[PDB]
Amino acid sequence: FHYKNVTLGVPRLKELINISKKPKTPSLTVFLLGQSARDAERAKDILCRLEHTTLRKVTANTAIYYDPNPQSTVVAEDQEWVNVYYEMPDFDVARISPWLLRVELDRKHMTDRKLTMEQIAEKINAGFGDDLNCIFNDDNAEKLVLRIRIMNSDENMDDDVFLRCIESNMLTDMTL
Amino acid sequence: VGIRFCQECNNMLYPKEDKENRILLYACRNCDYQQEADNSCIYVNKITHEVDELTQIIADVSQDPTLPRTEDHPCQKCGHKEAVFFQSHSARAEDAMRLYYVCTAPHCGHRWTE
Amino acid sequence: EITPDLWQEACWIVISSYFDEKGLVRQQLDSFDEFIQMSVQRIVEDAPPIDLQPPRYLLKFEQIYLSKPTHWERDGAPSPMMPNEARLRNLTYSAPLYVDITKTVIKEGEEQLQTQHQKTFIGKIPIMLRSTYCLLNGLTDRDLCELNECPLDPGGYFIINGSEKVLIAQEKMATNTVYVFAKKDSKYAYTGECRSCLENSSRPTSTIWVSMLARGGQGAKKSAIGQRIVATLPYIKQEVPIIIVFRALGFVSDRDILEHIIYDFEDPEMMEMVKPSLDEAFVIQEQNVALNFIGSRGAKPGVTKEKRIKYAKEVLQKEMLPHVGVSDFCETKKAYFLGYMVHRLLLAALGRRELDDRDHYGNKRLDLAGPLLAFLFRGMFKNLLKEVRIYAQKFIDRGKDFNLELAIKTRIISDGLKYSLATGNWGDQKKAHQARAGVSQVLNRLTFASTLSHLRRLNSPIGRDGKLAKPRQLHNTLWGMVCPAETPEGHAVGLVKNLALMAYISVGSQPSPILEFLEEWSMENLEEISPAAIADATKIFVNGCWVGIHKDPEQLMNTLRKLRRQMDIIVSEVSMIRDIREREIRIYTDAGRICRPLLIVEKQKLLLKKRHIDQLKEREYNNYSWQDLVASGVVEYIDTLEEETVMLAMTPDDLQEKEVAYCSTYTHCEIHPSMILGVCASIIPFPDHNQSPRNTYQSAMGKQAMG
Amino acid sequence: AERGELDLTGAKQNTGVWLVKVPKYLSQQWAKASGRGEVGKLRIAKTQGRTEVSFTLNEDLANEHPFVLQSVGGQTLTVFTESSSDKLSLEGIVVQRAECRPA
Amino acid sequence: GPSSQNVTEYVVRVPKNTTKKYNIMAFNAADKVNFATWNQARLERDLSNKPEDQPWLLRVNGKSGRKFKGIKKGGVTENTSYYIFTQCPDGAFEAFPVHNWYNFTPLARHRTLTAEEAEEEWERRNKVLNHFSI
Amino acid sequence: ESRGFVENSYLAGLTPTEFFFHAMGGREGLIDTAVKTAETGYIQRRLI
Ligand SMILES: [Zn+2]
Ligand SMILES: [Zn+2]
Incomplete structure (x- = not known):
């Protein structure tokens, strides 16, 4: 009780005497080679890259709206950057699916790990398939928003239940 | 964000989509009472x-x-x-x-x- | 009129008043007098008659008598046995038991012939020494010495085959309340519990869980809807969704169900959590098909339909929450309570209220000799009626006649009690494998302070070798009710414990006179109210049962209290809790709660004026004692639960002086902080100067000193 | 004219009735109703900010009961009958509920 | 107004007999039923129980009207009797005993469902969820 | 004061709300010794 968490005394002795496949507190001491071993910034970035970051550690909220056309935007501010997207709209080949997903991001946990929306949106598109569409803001703004739509090439499987299913699957399964 | 109860059998009104006027319709699954949605958003987390x-x-x-x-x-x-x-x-x-x-x-x- | 700094001689003059009246083993003597004046009359009175058959017969029992302990000589001449001969001749100290039986024959033979046989012999009950039914009750020292008895002997034990047996109080989890835990190993993310028993009338106690499945269920679309509230009813094999069991009571609509579970519809965060509970109980949408669903999986799978609809009817009516009501009527109450049980499970998932503690000593009850012998007397009175039938049917098919004095097997009750007491296993003779052992051990007579420390001892029934520390460590709630230093070493560390000097265990009473006062003090019943007038009201519980609401609690509370202070309607051993935040009020009247007296404090001054002391040092020829002190509203018994809504001061002359002060709203004050020690640990001089493990050794070592 | 036919006259007349809760001991006094069935007299005093109703026992019945008016809101109450000729009739709708308490 | 300054005194009688038993017929206020819409009604004891104990079956408007089921309350005179007080032309009050309390609730005529069919539907739906995954 | 700092000594004596805490700490050590002996009588014996 008196000393991280490492087991000592009797229970670690009876973990070493048999070969128990789940030790109660395993660890892995990590040494460094080059310039990363002396400066604190490089070592910290390496630790961030190593430690596992699921998507829900860098999210604020997820809100499923209903915009049948992207030019409606019941959301009271987001017509500006999807109007920047509306200067040249892309991927309206089959239809337009109305059911939308919308993630806000928290910049303390985001800038803590040196991440951005471009490699998150690179990961959640290249890696899942092409079943979604991931649009996002510019880094000038304070809030970080990325809108997600389902692919129209199936509508040419109710998409409310389906879109909540990928909403509660992308929050837990992304491994950034 | 709230919830909607049917006006006939007092049950839970589900959201549905009609391919005519592009408006959210709240439907029942015991009867088929209908009405439109005013805020046009369903889920928030x-x-x-x-x-x-x-x-x-x-x-x-x-x-x-x-x-x-x-x-x-x-x-x-x-x-x-x-x-x-x-x-x-x-x-x-x-x-x-x-x-x-x-x-x-x-x-x-x-x-x-x- | 105030008591300034004469306190050190004043606190020891009220403590003398306590022990001169109560004594040290009133724990044992009061639970016995209860079991034998009330708890035995109710068992035979509340028993089903044995109508049996052409003609048919009647038998029902009316009144119970007892006589003083008696010994039948070799030639059949009785004589009262004194407790000493019972020790010398290896006798047993017991008393015979009678009853009045009436027998009416019903053959509609133009006449209803009834007859009765009063004072019929049944058996023999052991007698605890120095009780109100012993031969030593209320004797003077000139007569106690004349029978060769010690005037200092405390009493409170049985004499069984020469030996001297003592019953150990067993601990037990409190009943009729909702507890929320979290098993972090199994499928459940949260769980509720409620052990119910309908006022000392059921051999078992039906328990019901209200679970909630885990979030990380590896699946496809269960991922989207979320966790589903489940229930595990008794006497059924499979889990059941809660909306189904709700509809089996009526309430098929989903606007009426979701007002028993959610009390205010301006809360979107909770309604979102109950939404995925309706989706799976959506296709089954009427009463009779619901009863079939639960009725399909029982102790017997129904082959037909009507039997399942019959089978599911009573199990949901006589095994679900029997403490609320067991009658087939009044099923709106079983709906509200089942709703409150679920409303409280959601609050533990949104993180609005903390989980319950298992070892918090306010959730425990104690089984003295009373609630232990009464449990053993039921299983042997039913067993005595089960074998009057077997003797009547064999004897009435031949149609001759009936005679009852030959039907009663008297060896059932006599040898039934005497066996389990003498050997300890709390069961039956052919049941020497299904019983709880360790009760009823032999009195320790090594030194006089090893005798007293045996009649005051608890025991937690957990295993004697389990390595889990949380049932063994010392808990904050043991302040003033269990001795902190006295415990044995070895394998039983912290499993047996001794109770402090002034700790007092309650005996029990009936909630009838408080209910009749509550209704006339503006308390709306549950039926005649609308579920929208429930958000700003304080739900009023009584003994575990939700019995109404109220809209002005703070004036109800200090009206309930000033009635108890002067003892008009409410006895002094009931506890009345009010938690401002959760907005409810609880009241208890049952037996097993542990109390201790304190000094009542008004604005900042004690209520014990000097007028009470100079007339309390005169009890010898004034007839003014402890009882006239409680009935004047200067002291008060305080339970453990009630002890969380109180603010104590440890000493008057030092903590109740106006200054830049710690607090200013003191509600009670202690008598002397030295009454937190047991019996064997209060013979140590200067115990506040030693290291702690040293005080534990001596308290387990002054029990084996010759004297 | 049929057994299962319910008269709706009372309801359609909007006939009102009063509902009063009475203790059994008083009700036991009332089973001994004086004369044809008279039990006493009811007194009603209303003021600009206070209304008082009470009942006083018949002198014969004796050998003040204030009323507590109770709300009927949240649940519509009506009275329906079954004759000794088993005919069915709706007498009215409940316009008042009340409880007799001693003084 | 007279509700404020109104005053009066009336005689109360409790007749030891009546020509008809008196019961209470209770409706949920939340429904706000227009009794004027009740052109006619039928009222019969419920047939599921295949008399005095029988729940009532109320059918509004003869052939084409609403339907309610009335369920008897557990008790009505277990501690306190309920009385109907009626005003008479002589101003005096007449009191009538409440024999019983029946709870009336609205009924959902539309829809028809099966147990075996419902269970079968549930498994297929459950199965569809597990199929076509990742 | 509220959570266990015993600021007196063994010669100046202990206050009540402080003797109770010292009894809690001494209790935990007594439980540890009993559990340790059972563990010792097995692990070492099996290895031999
Ligand atoms: Zn509906
Ligand atoms: Zn202020």
Whole structure:
């Protein structure tokens, strides 16, 4: 009780005497080679890259709206950057699916790990398939928003239940 | 964000989509009562969970004989110079050492953090 | 009129008043007098008649008598046995038991012939020494010495085959309340519990869980809807969704169900959590098909339909929450309570209220000799009626006649009690494998302070070798009710414990006179109210049962209290809790709660004026004692639960002086802080100067000193 | 004209009735109703900010009961009958509920 | 107004007999039923129970009208009797005993469902969820 | 004061709300010794 968490005394002795496949507190001491071993910034970035970051550690909220056309935007501010997207709209080949997903991001946990929306949106598109569409803001703004739509090439499987299913699957399964 | 009950059989109204006027329709699955949606949003999920408990604490806590009191911070809405303070006493206890106050004057019930 | 700094001689003059009246083993003597004046009359009175058959017969029992302990000589001449001969001749100290039986024959033979046989012999009950039914009750020292008895002997034990047996109080989890835990190993993310028993009338106690499945269920679309609230009813094999069991009581609509579970519809965060509970109980949408669903999986799978609809009817009516009501009527109450049980499970998932503690000593009850012998007397009175039938049917098919004095097997009750007491296993003779052992051990007579420390001892029934520390460590709630230093070493560390000097265990009473006062003090019943007038009201519980609401609690509370202070309607051993935050009020009247007296404090001054002392040092020829002190509202018994809504001062002359002070709203004050020690640990001089493990050794070592 | 036919006259007349809760001991006094069935007299005093109703026992029945008016809101109450000729009739809708308590 | 300054006194009688048993017929206020819409009604004891104990079956408007089921309350005179007080032309009050309390609730005529069919549907739906995954 | 700092000594004596805490700490050590002996009588024996 008196000393991280490492087991000592009797229970670690009876973990070493048999070969128990789940030790109660395993660890892995990590040494460094080059310039990363002396400066604190490089070592910290390496630790961030190593430690596992699921998507829900860098999210604020997820809100499923209903915009049948992207030019409606019941959301009271987001017509500006999807109007920047509306200067040249892309991927309206089959239809337009109305059911939308919308993630806000928290910049303390985001800038803590040196991440951005471009490699998150690179990961959640290249890696899942092409079943979604991931649009996002510019880094000038304070809030970080990325809108997600389902692919129209199936509508040419109710998409409310389906879109909540990928909403509660992308929050837990992304491994950034 | 709320919930909708049917006006005939008093059950839960589900959202549905019609391919005619592009408007959200709330339907029932026992009868088929219908109506349109005014806010046109269905699901919302708050993960920050930064709800300020100023909306959850009750005004009658100032009747507790086991809570500390103060003469320093007076009430603003009535000017009473006696308050009773405490902590969050709930979840979200990562950095939770704030100090919510409640005025102790009868029939004031004013609450405020600092 | 105040008592300034004469306190050190004043606190020891009220403590003398306590022990001169109560004594040290009133724990044992009061639970016995209860079991034998009330708890035995109710068992035979509340028993089903044995109508049996052409003609048919009647038999029902009316009144019970007892006589003083008696010994039948070799030639059949009785004589009262004194407790000493019972020790010398290896006798047993017991008393015979009678009853009045009436027998009416019903053959509609133009006449209803009834007859009765009063004072019929049944058996023999052991007698605890120095009780109100012993031969030593109320004797003077000149007569106690004349029978060769010690005037200092405390009493409170049985004499069984020469030996001297003592019953150990067993601990037990409190009943009729909702507890929320979290099993972090199994499929459940949260769980509720409620052990119910309908006022000392059921051999078992039906328990019901209200679970909630885990979030990380590896699946496809269960991922989107979320966790589903489940229930595990008794006497059924499979889990059941809650909306189904709700509809089996009526309430098929989903606007009426979701007002028993959610009390205010301005809360979107909770309604979102109950939404995925309706989706799976959506296709089954009427009463009779619901009863079939639960009725399909029982102790017997129904082959037909009507039997399942019959089978599911009573199990949901006589095994679900029997403490609320067991009658087939009043099923709106079983709906509200089942709703409150679920409303409280959601609050533990949103993180608005903390989980319950298992070892918090306010959730425990104690089984003295009373609630232990009464449990053993039921299983042997039913067993005596089960074998009057077997003798009547064999004897009435031949149609001759009936005679009852030959039907009663008297060896059932006599040898039934005497066996389990003498050997300890709390069961039956052919049941020497299904019983709880360790009760009823032999009195220790090594030194006089090893005798007293045996009649005051608890025991937690957990295993004697389990390595889990949380049932063994010392808990904050043991202040003033269990001795902190006295415990044995070895394998039983912290499993047996001794109770402090002034700790007092309650005996029990009936909630009838408080209910009749509550209704006339503006308390709306549950039926005649609208579920929208429930958000700003304080739900009023009584003994575990939700019995109404109220809209001005703070004036109800200090009206309930000033009635108890002067003892008009409410006895002094009931506890009345009010928690401001959760907005409810609880009241208890049952037996097993542990109390201790304190001094009542008004604005900042004690209520014990000097007028009470100079007339309390005169009890010898004034007839003013402890009882006239409680009935004047200067002391008060305080339970463990009630002890969380109180603010104590440890000493008057030092903590109740106006200054830049710690607190200013003191509600009670202690008598002397030295009454937190047991019996064997209060003979140590200067115990506040030693290291702690040293005080534990001596308290387990002064029990084996010759004297 | 049929057994299962319910008269709706009372309801359609909007006929009103009063509902009063009475203790059994008083009700036992009332089973001994004086004369044809008279039990006493009811007194009603209404003021600008206070209304008082009470009942006083018949002198014969004796050998003040204030009323507590109770709300009927939240649940519509009506009275329906079954004759000794088993005919069915709706007499009215409940316009008042009340409880007799001693003084 | 007279509700404020109104005053009066009336005689109360409790007749030891009546020509008809008196019961209470209770409706949920939340429904706000227009009794004027009740052109006719039928009222019969419920047939599921295949008499005095029988729940009532109320059929509004003869052939084409609403339907309610009335369920008897557990008790009505277990501690206190309920009385109907009626005003008479002589101003005096007449009191009538309440024999019983029946609870009336609205009925959902539309829809028809099966147990075996419902269970079968549930498994297929459950199965569809597990199919076509990742 | 509220959570266990015993600021007196063994010669100046202990206050009540402080003797109770010292009894809690001494209790935990007594439980540890009993559990340790059972563990010792097995692990070492099996290895031999
Ligand atoms: Zn509907
Ligand atoms: Zn104020």
